Amino acid sequence: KIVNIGAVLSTRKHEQMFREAVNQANKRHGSWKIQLNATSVTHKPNAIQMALSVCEDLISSQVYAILVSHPPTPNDHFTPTPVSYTAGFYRIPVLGLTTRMSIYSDKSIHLSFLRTVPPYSHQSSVWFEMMRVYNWNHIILLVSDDHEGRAAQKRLETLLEERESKAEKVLQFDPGTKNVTALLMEARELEARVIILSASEDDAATVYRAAAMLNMTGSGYVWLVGEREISGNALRYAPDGIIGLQLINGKNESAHISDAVGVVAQAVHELLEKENITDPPRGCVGNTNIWKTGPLFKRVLMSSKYADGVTGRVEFNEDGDRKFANYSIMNLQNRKLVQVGIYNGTHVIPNDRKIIWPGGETEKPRGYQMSTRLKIVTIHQEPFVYVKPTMSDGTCKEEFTVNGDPVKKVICTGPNDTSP
Amino acid sequence: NKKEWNGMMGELLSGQADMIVAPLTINNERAQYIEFSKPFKYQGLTILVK
Amino acid sequence: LNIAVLLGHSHDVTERELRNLWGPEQATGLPLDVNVVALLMNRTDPKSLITHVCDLMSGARIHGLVFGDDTDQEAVAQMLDFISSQTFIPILGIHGGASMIMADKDPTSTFFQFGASIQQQATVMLKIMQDYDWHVFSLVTTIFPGYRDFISFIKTTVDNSFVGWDMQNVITLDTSFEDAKTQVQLKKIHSSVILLYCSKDEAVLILSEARSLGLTGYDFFWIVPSLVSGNTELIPKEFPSGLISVSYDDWDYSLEARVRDGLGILTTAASSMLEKFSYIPEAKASCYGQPLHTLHQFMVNVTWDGKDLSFTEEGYQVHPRLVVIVLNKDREWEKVGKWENQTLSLRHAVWPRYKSFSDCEPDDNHLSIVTLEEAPFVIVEDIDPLTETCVRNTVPCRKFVKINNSTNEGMNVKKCCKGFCIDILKKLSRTVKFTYDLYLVTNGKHGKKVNNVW
Amino acid sequence: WDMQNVITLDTSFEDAKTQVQLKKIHSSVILLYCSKDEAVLILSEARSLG
Amino acid sequence: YFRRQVELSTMYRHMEKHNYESAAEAIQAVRDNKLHAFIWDSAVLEFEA
Numbered sequence A: 001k002i003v004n005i006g007a008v009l010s011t012r013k014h015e016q017m018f019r020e021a022v023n024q025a026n027k028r029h030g031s032w033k034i035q036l037n038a039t040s041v042t043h044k045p046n047a048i049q050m051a052l053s054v055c056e057d058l059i060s061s062q063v064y065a066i067l068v069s070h071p072p073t074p075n076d077h078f079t080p081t082p083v084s085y086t087a088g089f090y091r092i093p094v095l096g097l098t099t100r101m102s103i104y105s106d107k108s109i110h111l112s113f114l115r116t117v118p119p120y121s122h123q124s125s126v127w128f129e130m131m132r133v134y135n136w137n138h139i140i141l142l143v144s145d146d147h148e149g150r151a152a153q154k155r156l157e158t159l160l161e162e163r164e165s166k167a168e169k170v171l172q173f174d175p176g177t178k179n180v181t182a183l184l185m186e187a188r189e190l191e192a193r194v195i196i197l198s199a200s201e202d203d204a205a206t207v208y209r210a211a212a213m214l215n216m217t218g219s220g221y222v223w224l225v226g227e228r229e230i231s232g233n234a235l236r237y238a239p240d241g242i243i244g245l246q247l248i249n250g251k252n253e254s255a256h257i258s259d260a261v262g263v264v265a266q267a268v269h270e271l272l273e274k275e276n277i278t279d280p281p282r283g284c285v286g287n288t289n290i291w292k293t294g295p296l297f298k299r300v301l302m303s304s305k306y307a308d309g310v311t312g313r314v315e316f317n318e319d320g321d322r323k324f325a326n327y328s329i330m331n332l333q334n335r336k337l338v339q340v341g342i343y344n345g346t347h348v349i350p351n352d353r354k355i356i357w358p359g360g361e362t363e364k365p366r367g368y369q370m371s372t373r374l375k376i377v378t379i380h381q382e383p384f385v386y387v388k389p390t391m392s393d394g395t396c397k398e399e400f401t402v403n404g405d406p407v408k409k410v411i412c413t414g415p416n417d418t419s420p
Numbered sequence B: 001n002k003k004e005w006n007g008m009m010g011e012l013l014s015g016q017a018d019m020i021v022a023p024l025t026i027n028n029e030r031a032q033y034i035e036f037s038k039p040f041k042y043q044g045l046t047i048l049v050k
Numbered sequence C: 001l002n003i004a005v006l007l008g009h010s011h012d013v014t015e016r017e018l019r020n021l022w023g024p025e026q027a028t029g030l031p032l033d034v035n036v037v038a039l040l041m042n043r044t045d046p047k048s049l050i051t052h053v054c055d056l057m058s059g060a061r062i063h064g065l066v067f068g069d070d071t072d073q074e075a076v077a078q079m080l081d082f083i084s085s086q087t088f089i090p091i092l093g094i095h096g097g098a099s100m101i102m103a104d105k106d107p108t109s110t111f112f113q114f115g116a117s118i119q120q121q122a123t124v125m126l127k128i129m130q131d132y133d134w135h136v137f138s139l140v141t142t143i144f145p146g147y148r149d150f151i152s153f154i155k156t157t158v159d160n161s162f163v164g165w166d167m168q169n170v171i172t173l174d175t176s177f178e179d180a181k182t183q184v185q186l187k188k189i190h191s192s193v194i195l196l197y198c199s200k201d202e203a204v205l206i207l208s209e210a211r212s213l214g215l216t217g218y219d220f221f222w223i224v225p226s227l228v229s230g231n232t233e234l235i236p237k238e239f240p241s242g243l244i245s246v247s248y249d250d251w252d253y254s255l256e257a258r259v260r261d262g263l264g265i266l267t268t269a270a271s272s273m274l275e276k277f278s279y280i281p282e283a284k285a286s287c288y289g290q291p292l293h294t295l296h297q298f299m300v301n302v303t304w305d306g307k308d309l310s311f312t313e314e315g316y317q318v319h320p321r322l323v324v325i326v327l328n329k330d331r332e333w334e335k336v337g338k339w340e341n342q343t344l345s346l347r348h349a350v351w352p353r354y355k356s357f358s359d360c361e362p363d364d365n366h367l368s369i370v371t372l373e374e375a376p377f378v379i380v381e382d383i384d385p386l387t388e389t390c391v392r393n394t395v396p397c398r399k400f401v402k403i404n405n406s407t408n409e410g411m412n413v414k415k416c417c418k419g420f421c422i423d424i425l426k427k428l429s430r431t432v433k434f435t436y437d438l439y440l441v442t443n444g445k446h447g448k449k450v451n452n453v454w
Numbered sequence D: 001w002d003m004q005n006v007i008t009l010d011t012s013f014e015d016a017k018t019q020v021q022l023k024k025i026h027s028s029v030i031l032l033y034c035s036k037d038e039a040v041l042i043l044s045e046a047r048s049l050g
Numbered sequence E: 001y002f003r004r005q006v007e008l009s010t011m012y013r014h015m016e017k018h019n020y021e022s023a024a025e026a027i028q029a030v031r032d033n034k035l036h037a038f039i040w041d042s043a044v045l046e047f048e049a
């Protein structure tokens, strides 16, 4: 008649808020004889013995939900992976709350991982909403993180399946290098100016410095970044007038904990109304038998529909992501973050503030400038393409035909013979 | 086991070229991959003998 | 160097044959101190994994971990990948859940598997479909994960193959089927070859709906991967007898030969890396407590005793050993074909019918047709080596060519045919709309009776 | 006339063996001869078939 | 275009042993009476005639 909830939480004030939310979860659910216990664990700077302590403590506690709620970690790995893997050995849902990596989106790897935050590729759909507003077709993709790069390419092809257009340039490379300005100039020679960037803070600051030194931040250059690219030294290296995104209550932990408590509590009270109740065994010593209602409780969590919370309509898709997310659209006006738009789950509305661009007017810059110098290639056709060597140095002998027509030649460039 | 093109099509699809100005033999295979313009030349085939 | 081989098995596989796997193996020993530690584990919990890793990593700095699994848990390989990411030790997965295919590795992890991924398996299955001219097909994808990569790989493979595949649109799913909206998509199916990517408990309901909708006919084919086909003992009765599967589970090569090949790869990598850099043994001292020269991108070039055991960029084998099996009428996964380096071998080149999938299937529509090699009638030529496909007017056939006169064993070489009677037979197949079974005779000429024997 | 083979029903359909004969239909004009009660089920099955 | 023609595979197997790099190589080879026929466009050979 008890339900245990495991948590990896640091601060004592948010532990008290979590215990208060557990205590208030049994308020409106009547005088039913179910009980709710909570067990929270603290930090150690390592990761192997942390995984050991948490996994055997949650085996000895026999919990149903495992929560990790640590945004400001000094290690940039952001890996609650081993506790989720240990719970996936018995198919126990771990509700991740902080990270947004696309490696957690693979349910074949993370068998029993759920989360209430989407990955950044859904922001590209918001950027596809830009394509629904500003009517721009040709884009320039730049992704350094190859763990999420294939998922970003997949989401981009899924978005472009509707219009049946094609991305003009895609780029994937190893993060850490600095001489990527050649591909930046190759994208500069293209007609489009739409710049989509998906990397960490260091590569974003590197390409900001590369665009600042080569002046790729002038008129018409479309810049469109996210929350990871407007933090750290990338915010210092950002040009004025850049358009970015903001997660509403993305780092606000206190209401997020209460939302997670409400989700887990209504999931448990939904599961108590059905049959075939199983319990996690003492899997540390002599128990390798899996928890048989793993996918059953996962199917319970699939159809979880909610109506409570400050954020709003939290809802899981087939990937277990977040539906109907309020986003903000920010602008950098003279090294100051200025809000220029709001976003409900389907539509963008700009606010009363104006949209000041890094180029000219406040309207949208049509960054689709066709090539005024069309690169012409041809084969040496014998009666059609006459190729003559130069006389002295790069010159053409202006000979005249028998019908009074002067031959208007052109300075072309060509190889001499075959490759052997 | 990947299909690739070469020649003028290989230099055009790589982005290094913009417009092939050449007597392009219009067929059904290349029409599936790129768009075609109106033909300026109209002729057939023949056999060169001595 | 110091390599530990721990095995979690239920079958009585002893340990002393691993002690005998040290002596005659590595006769040309380039490391001066090669030692093995053979251990057997009875439980399969990750607590024992962490405990034995902390024992053997502190056990005189073991740099090699080899694990095989007997259970059906794919999370054990993910735990060993996390252990290889934390401890920076090259760890190899041999059998079972240690060899189950995972999607994406990490540069921090040096874990590797001796298996066959779903992409190379899809390549082999589309090679099978190309070798049979089964160009009109379909694709049904459920909500089982790892499915959009499968669809995209099929799309790129159709866009990069000389067939020009007549592919029906993808039948997609959202939940367990209501048989209301999925019924319309299943009733769009009129093609023969049906591809599917799901789990086993989903596949039971899929095959039950297909039998309920009559999709298990003699014309209709069913090709499934190795991830849906689980234990060889657990076969439910709802499977159609003739179910095509491709799995790398080879019973001819035991676990001892596979771990011997893994030890050969480890010693090859150690001997080739010792020739480049000196201070090669570098591991972590102990688990309690708060790397440059690695073998993560070094043993791509490897070949042990002539066996092409090279490694991919994703961490899998370049040329694994795929096994094509079917389901016979005796409800057993019958071993049929094996796979070469890049090309495909077929022990049964004659494609069997298995026309009676159930008991009440009265069907007599196939026709056995044989002809003779004559020049103005049946032009018999080789298959095109550029396409490995008979061109659209030519039809494939077989010819049982013997090797010698010493043995009666031969091979059914597949060739292309055109001409007059080929066009006659194709127009008969256009008009009557039947199914034909074309092959060649190897006895000889038209006919002659020798003592009541034609 | 280009007449396709006669699709003969047997009982109230299991939608297993009759569907095999219904998927053989590639013609345009479908000629149906039945009563009012079975016609609803036949048209619903044909709408489910597309 | 001849590869699409599924009834002239004999010419496809015959011409693959003598394919040249450029058409001017074929003009020079038939100029030395080493070739005998060459499929080509009309007006180019009309201008060369």
Ligand SMILES: *[C@@H]1O[C@H](CO)[C@@H](O[C@@H]2O[C@H](CO)[C@@H](O)[C@H](O)[C@H]2NC(C)=O)[C@H](O)[C@H]1NC(C)=O
Pocket (backbone or CB within 6 Å): A344, A345, A346, A347, A348, A349
């Ligand atoms: C935020 O939510 C509101 C209410 O759900 C949305 O309003 C409806 O949105 C749908 C889809 O765009 C429209 O078809 C309806 O006509 C809208 N209802 C109304 C007001 O008639 C709204 O679109 C969302 N975003 C905003 C504020 O635009």
Ligand SMILES: *[C@@H]1O[C@H](CO)[C@@H](O)[C@H](O)[C@H]1NC(C)=O
Pocket (backbone or CB within 6 Å): A037, A038, A039, A040
């Ligand atoms: C309830 O949780 C508390 C805090 O984690 C723990 O000390 C206690 O063991 C649990 N309840 C029991 C079993 O008394």
Ligand SMILES: *[C@@H]1O[C@H](CO)[C@@H](O)[C@H](O)[C@H]1NC(C)=O
Pocket (backbone or CB within 6 Å): A178, A179, A180, A181, A182, A210, A213
């Ligand atoms: C090397 O990086 C610098 C960064 O400023 C850049 O200016 C330069 O173009 C790069 N060199 C190449 C080869 O791209």
Ligand SMILES: *[C@@H]1O[C@H](CO)[C@@H](O)[C@H](O)[C@H]1NC(C)=O
Pocket (backbone or CB within 6 Å): A214, A215, A216
């Ligand atoms: C940098 O800005 C100057 C004007 O201050 C401009 O002339 C130059 O073209 C810019 N650099 C490039 C190559 O964009």
Ligand SMILES: *[C@@H]1O[C@H](CO)[C@@H](O)[C@H](O)[C@H]1NC(C)=O
Pocket (backbone or CB within 6 Å): A252, A253, A254, A255, A256
């Ligand atoms: C955001 O933060 C505050 C303080 O933590 C708290 O009220 C709650 O978590 C959120 N609500 C707002 C908008 O104040």
Ligand SMILES: *[C@@H]1O[C@H](CO)[C@@H](O)[C@H](O)[C@H]1NC(C)=O
Pocket (backbone or CB within 6 Å): A275, A276
């Ligand atoms: C538990 O599941 C099984 C299999 O679906 C079912 O037969 C049984 O009725 C369920 N238990 C109860 C008490 O409903």
Ligand SMILES: *[C@@H]1O[C@H](CO)[C@@H](O)[C@H](O)[C@H]1NC(C)=O
Pocket (backbone or CB within 6 Å): A311, A312, A313, A324, A325, A326, A344, A345
């Ligand atoms: C976004 O916020 C507004 C104001 O709180 C709210 O009305 C709306 O429901 C939110 N968006 C969602 C969750 O659809």
Ligand SMILES: *[C@@H]1O[C@H](CO)[C@@H](O)[C@H](O)[C@H]1NC(C)=O
Pocket (backbone or CB within 6 Å): A416
């Ligand atoms: C280019 O080819 C011409 C003609 O054979 C030759 O005269 C010239 O030397 C070549 N260019 C080189 C190799 O510098």
Ligand SMILES: *[C@@H]1O[C@H](CO)[C@@H](O)[C@H](O)[C@H]1NC(C)=O
Pocket (backbone or CB within 6 Å): C040, C041, C042, C043
């Ligand atoms: C096998 O299981 C027993 C408990 O029954 C345990 O003591 C032992 O350590 C296990 N390991 C071996 C030696 O297989």
Ligand SMILES: *[C@@H]1O[C@H](CO)[C@@H](O)[C@H](O)[C@H]1NC(C)=O
Pocket (backbone or CB within 6 Å): C301, C302
């Ligand atoms: C691979 O390794 C062998 C070791 O002798 C070496 O000779 C060869 O050059 C290398 N290259 C290949 C074939 O990958």
Ligand SMILES: *[C@@H]1O[C@H](CO)[C@@H](O)[C@H](O)[C@H]1NC(C)=O
Pocket (backbone or CB within 6 Å): C340, C341, C342, C343
């Ligand atoms: C298999 O092995 C041979 C010999 O090394 C090699 O030449 C061939 O390319 C490989 N491919 C085949 C035919 O499977």
Ligand SMILES: *[C@@H]1O[C@H](CO)[C@@H](O)[C@H](O)[C@H]1NC(C)=O
Pocket (backbone or CB within 6 Å): C402, C403, C404, C405, C406
């Ligand atoms: C049998 O093998 C011998 C080996 O020399 C060969 O000469 C002979 O032609 C073979 N017979 C046939 C025709 O298979």
Ligand SMILES: *[C@@H]1O[C@H](CO)[C@@H](O)[C@H](O)[C@H]1NC(C)=O
Pocket (backbone or CB within 6 Å): C404, C405
């Ligand atoms: C092998 O058998 C063939 C059958 O036609 C025959 O022609 C040939 O002479 C035989 N070879 C010998 C010499 O055994």
